[PDB]
């Protein structure tokens, strides 16, 4: 019920009332699903102190170094608006339901990457669950991963292009789970596939 949040190197139960207070005080709430070492989320947190930047990742021990520098005083690189949550997107806590003004999936790997490419329901629904209505979903995937050697988790999958996003039915599956595709574009450095969706009612 309380979020399992990082406090430096240790894991912590975040006080449900403090969690609500932080959201209210924030002008915008941004959720980074799949953070890695979460230093991208940290840079965002430092760049936008009025934003509540929530980093979500199951591998919480890789975020610890960032969590340490974030826990410091403001004069030494502290980011009190950064919240690193230990969780998978497939099984998100109820405290994370509908909290996001924006959901980002930047350079995913493993199940998150494969889930996004294939359009797995458990992943897409988990992404949808944390978003407020009208919230944008940003997915960024570097297309260099389909060069050899190709990572195992997308090894059997054809390269994701704007045309394949449609032809594979990924767009349909996003639509059936509450995500309305707004834009898809290749951006070259390495080409980066950008997908933009908006949180809506699940149709088909």
Residue numbers in the entry: 5 to 192, 212 to 227
What do the study's own words say?
However, exceptionally high-level aminoglycoside-resistance is achieved by the action of intrinsic and acquired 16S ribosomal RNA (rRNA) methyltransferase enzymes in aminoglycoside-producing and human pathogenic bacteria, respectively. These resistance determinants block drug binding by catalyzing the transfer of a methyl group from their cosubstrate S-adenosyl-l-methionine (SAM) to the base of a defined target RNA nucleotide within the ribosomal A-site. Here, we describe detailed structural and functional analyses of one of these enzymes, the kanamycin-resistance methyltransferase from Catenulisporales acidiphilia (‘CacKam’). CacKam has a SAM-binding core fold comprised of a seven-stranded β-sheet with a central topological switch point, characteristic of Class I methyltransferases.
To assess the relative contributions of these two interactions to the observed β6/7 linker structure, individual D21A and W203A substitutions were created for further functional and structural analyses. In contrast, substitution of the universally conserved W203 to alanine resulted in complete loss of resistance, consistent with previous analyses of equivalent substitutions in KamB and NpmA. In contrast, although CacKam-W203A also crystallized in space group P212121, the substitution results in a new unit cell with an altered packing arrangement and two molecules in the asymmetric unit. Changes in the CacKam-W203A structure are confined to the β6/7 linker, which is disordered in both chains. Additionally, D21 is no longer involved in crystal packing interactions made by either CacKam-W203A molecule. Thus, only direct disruption of the interaction of W203 with R43/ R73 through the W203A substitution is sufficient to induce changes in the β6/7 linker structure and the crystal lattice. Critically, in terms of β6/7 linker structure and dynamics in solution, the intensity of cleavage at R206 (bands c and d) is increased upon W203A, W203F or R43A/R73A substitution, consistent with increased flexibility in the absence of the R43/W203/R73 double cation–π interaction to stabilize the β6/7 linker conformation. In contrast, CacKam-W203A showed minimal methylation capacity, consistent with its inactivity in the MIC assay.
